[PDB]
Symmetry: D3
Subunit: 214 residues, 6 copies
């Protein structure tokens, strides 16, 4: 089952350029390569996506489950470097997924219903010694996992409506009602401007604005 929701992945998988990239990645691996890309191994093609989109591995954009969605250490604010486990990784209600990277570094994601956290490899982590710093909030976030976004997802729903063929007025009627739209829709109307603002907000998130959520 889908444990958690990755909002940045919901933005990225709706990017038309990423969808085109993934379909190209599938075609050259199914008809020009070794075949189908559980045992996650980052290839060279996947590292191109990490340097371009942020995900360490090309993930099917049709699937909302972010189990195999790993975010680059160069971008993630929910990752730590760990040196050398069974206690943290086997709580009834906490799952984990592993990924072997191109530089032979092992990334393990710890996730539950409250989010995810990535560990790049007892368990010891080198925390930067900065007095009165919010760098310790990473440990608090990991504890919350082992223990506006509803409006943001509604913006992505509007993008799904557009790509289905619905017009701005169609989406306006869906949100405000047929009677309100017939009475107020105009050239410089505020109902039209609100729907346009929904598109602009979501487009900015989809066109790499999701990077600011990592």
């Amino acid at each position: 089952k889908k444990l958690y929701n990755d909002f940045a992945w919901e933005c990225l998988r709706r990017n038309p350029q990423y969808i085109s990239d993934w379909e190209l990645f599938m075609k050259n691996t199914l008809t020009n390569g070794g075949g189908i890309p559980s045992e996650l191994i980052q290839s060279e093609l996947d590292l191109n996506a990490e340097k371009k989109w942020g995900v360490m591995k090309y993930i099917d954009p049709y699937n909302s489950d972010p189990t195999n969605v790993f975010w680059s250490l160069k971008l993630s604010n929910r990752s730590v470097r760990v040196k050398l486990w069974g206690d943290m990784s086997n709580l009834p209600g906490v799952k984990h997924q592993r990924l072997l990277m191109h530089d032979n570094t092992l990334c393990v994601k710890i996730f539950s219903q409250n989010g995810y956290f990535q560990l790049f490899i007892x368990x010891x982590x080198x925390x930067x010694x900065x007095x009165x710093x919010x760098x310790x909030x990473x440990x608090x976030x990991x504890x919350x996992x082992x223990x506006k976004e509803e409006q943001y997802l509604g913006l992505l729903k509007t993008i799904d409506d557009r790509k289905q063929g619905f017009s701005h007025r169609d989406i306006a009627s869906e949100i405000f009602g047929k009677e309100l739209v017939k009475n107020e829709w105009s050239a410089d109307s505020w109902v039209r401007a609100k729907i346009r603002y929904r598109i602009k907000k979501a487009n900015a998130l989809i066109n790499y604005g999701y990077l600011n959520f990592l």
Copy 2:
């Protein structure tokens, strides 16, 4: 003096389309209209900018002081409707600016060194009665004014470097050093990918991503 910094305004005033819009707005008002646009009155041309960019009045993009930068009620999460003052508006260290809107509604912004807050017109405000809701956080934000963003501004600094003519490698040397760049710059290098990610992050903020900060 510049009391506070409006991060959304720092994004918007760097938008090339908004800069072009403002220069067009100045030309048709200086050579085709009544002349120069302290006594802020929202005209019809200003309301077009409110429905397009979010600011209730065209503001010179060259000035960082957000004194006369007013944000639309349709977008602002720092605004309330107030019905009918001298105590709140005259604290030593708290300033205020007024704007008369096209619909004859008066908007008064209360700001200090900790941010701004807009009041749309004793003083009584109709707060929505929702049990266990964060709608009361608006009153807490107003109290904080009457009593990552350093990284976000650094992203906009990179946009200023680009518009000046500096290349991606030039900006990479500015941040990481000439020696590191000469050794590591390549086609699919991570230093080049980091600089590209800076541009993408800032571009998303500039291209209406600032709306998610209102």
Copy 3:
């Protein structure tokens, strides 16, 4: 069943002048008026009681259940003005009662086991904008309802003992014991002074002192 206890009503319904007023109100409505006064409608006679005693409707003083006991907006510190619900009014454990006032204003009381709260008419309330004010405590009190007084009720129990015909010494024996009273009762004895202080405390509450508890 009796959900909560209104201490101010316990004081008022023990007032001999109010009891006489209610019996007069019943006689002129049962033998001179339309008959018996679930569908609470404030008449002109009830508004006389609101301007005299504080309750918006004459309530039988023999009943301790304060379901239909409504307190005047001119006196209540547990009331708000609300403009235009099913979520707040239908929690398993929270009841409500309505009253239509003489000025056609609808008062709805929301009560549970932790107290009551009155709303005078989504749901929006005009809260006075006063910085660093305890006016927001009304919302906290309403949240506590939707989520010394044992000594004060003992004082009213002493009034019930007096109206039954028990003397001050009888009540002293009831509280301190027959042996203590026989040994210590005197003209200027402290046991007699304590019982007198009980009466004075309760009489002050009954003779409009309950108004300070609204």
Copy 4:
């Protein structure tokens, strides 16, 4: 100078029966007794006032300074029994006053700008051992002294206006304005009912309602 304000004393000294009692107490001590009643010693006449009014010593009702106003142990919720000091009693900003009682018990009041506290006689106090009890709040109140009431005093101001000869309408004009009163004053008017409610509230406090504030 007057350090603090005793609200219960402000109620009691406005009681006409207490004022008559004090004037009788002065006459029988100035023309029938030893003369004038700094060295506070509770006599037999003072103990009659303690059993009747609550103050351990007859105090001039014309003086608002509650320095020599001591409240009976039988009524005070701000008193403790102490067994056997210079550290607590000599803080720059904390004063103290002593009273020798008729039963040879010494009462010492510790007061500052935040209130008063009475000690009835190192310093050790026998606190009742009750689990999860608010009896320890007496120590917190004493710490606050060594470290609605503005509306209540306004009610007593209305009593001062009445005893000066001002009518209910005069006081209504003082609070609401001459124009409002001339327009709204009537037989069953709400402006008249509000002023009547002020009197009733204050009268209840004055007629032994202050006992509930000790």
Copy 5:
């Protein structure tokens, strides 16, 4: 069953001099006295142990249950003087034990799974009146009972290993492993110094260092 663990008793009952004292106390009472020492009565011989070891009664050092282990008022930081109960002493999960002392003072210990507390004789206790003092922490500790030490007990386990005949190297192998000890054991080795430090730490606790834990 054993409700709680008294760490000071775990130190004292491992003291060789106390074990010798108890065996002498048993011999002179079983072959020279009245016989066997539920009804705890402190004799003169027991008071010698109170002035020497701290326990008000000689307790068999072989038993870890500290039910009858009472600590002297001259040493205990978990004791109060109480003057004159059924509510506190009969919570489902809270037990109590009584001891009659040589000076006819009754000591009652209240204990549960969270520790013990001793009362030396309603229930009233004379608390010292000291402003901003931690003397009130005794009431908080008693409330916690009515509602490093795992490392310290491991130090006493090392003493048990020594008295059984195990050498320092034997205990080193028990803690660090046979392979580590064979490789690192030397004259001035750190593994030998760590085991020596364990002994010194525990010996200090056993040789009256437990007094600092009362």
Copy 6:
């Protein structure tokens, strides 16, 4: 000036065996070695003291200033391993001292008026990743330094009195008074037992009991 007080050092420097060890260490270095032991370098003789007493360097027991008193990593609960500073080490009111160890590891002590903290070598520290662990309290203790013990020092004062030649009765008179001692001193007296308990408590601290305070 002496910034802070090291209680464990106050115990250790009063140890007669350590004082003898230090005098032997001085004699073999002043008449058999290189001479006098600001530039702290741990020699082989100093490491013998680290494995025996805990201090990384022999310190003159006559000096109470614990500036050059360093505690072994094998014993200190106020030390961390740090990998590679000017911000933390140069606060107006925070000093630091360095020591080069026999294994070429550099130990730097950061201390102020609130205590000391040792760092064994930006600045990064490998913190053990244990969920719901008190290992993070080391960072809180370091923050407190960069931002019963009065009774324990009184116990060491009693040891100073003994080594000066004062008897147990002399110390009893010093604490309780000449009159109390002359009246109560006996064979099995409690005043004599209290003084004996002071000695036993302090002796346990001095004879390696200080290790439990590191």
